[PDB]
Amino acid sequence: KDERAREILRGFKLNWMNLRDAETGKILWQGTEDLSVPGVEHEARVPKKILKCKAVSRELNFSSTEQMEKFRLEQKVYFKGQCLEEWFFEFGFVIPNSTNTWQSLIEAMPASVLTGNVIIETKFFDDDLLVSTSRVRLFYV
Numbered sequence: 001k002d003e004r005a006r007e008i009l010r011g012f013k014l015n016w017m018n019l020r021d022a023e024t025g026k027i028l029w030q031g032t033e034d035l036s037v038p039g040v041e042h043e044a045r046v047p048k049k050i051l052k053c054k055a056v057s058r059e060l061n062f063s064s065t066e067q068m069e070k071f072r073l074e075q076k077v078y079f080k081g082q083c084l085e086e087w088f089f090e091f092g093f094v095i096p097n098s099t100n101t102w103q104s105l106i107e108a109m110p111a112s113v114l115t116g117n118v119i120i121e122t123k124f125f126d127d128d129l130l131v132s133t134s135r136v137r138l139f140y141v
């Protein structure tokens with residue numbers, strides 16, 4: 001059960017990801033490093049104009065050796081320790097040993113005040129079950 005969360009973490013990998021202006025479909029940020037690895041504070045530099053898109057599109061590519069009934073995400077935006085927004089997204093069923101693209105739409109203080117002060121804390125779940133908790137500190141450039 002906490003053992004099951006541990007196997008799912010073991011078999012999981014986020015292979016690549018990007019963030020797009022939903023209005024134009026232009027890539028604003030992409031990376032192939034697994035930002036959802038727990039135990040370390042990740043960092044990401046994004047263009048300051050991403051804050052001006054009302055709709056941001058995300059593509060997440062991941063592999064999973066374990067099956068999952070209801071793979072989903074809870075994401076919290078923290079500015080200097082205070083939670084400002086919460087986002088929920090759901091993938092659902094994941095086939096064991098599969099690789100999957102998951103597309104999500106994310107929808108609607110200046111850059112210079114936010115930059116370095118925002119942590120996006122992401123929790124992965126199989127249903128009620130918490131697989132991992134990770135952090136990215138954001139810089140806006």
Ligand SMILES: O=C(OC[C@H](C1CCNCC1)n1c(-c2ccccc2)nc2ccccc21)C1CCN(c2nc3ccccc3n2Cc2ccccc2)CC1
Pocket residue numbers: 019029035036044046050051052053054055056058060075077084087106107108114118120122136138
């Ligand atoms: O912070 C968010 O909410 C959106 C908000 C938007 C402003 C534009 N209009 C609609 C909402 N936002 C904000 C934001 C932060 C504070 C106040 C206002 C806006 N900063 C953003 C930076 C990049 C993209 C969106 C950002 C996204 C940021 C990216 N994100 C995310 N999903 C992940 C999945 C796996 C691992 C990491 C994940 N992240 C964090 C992340 C952060 C930067 C680069 C890559 C990833 C989901 C939540």
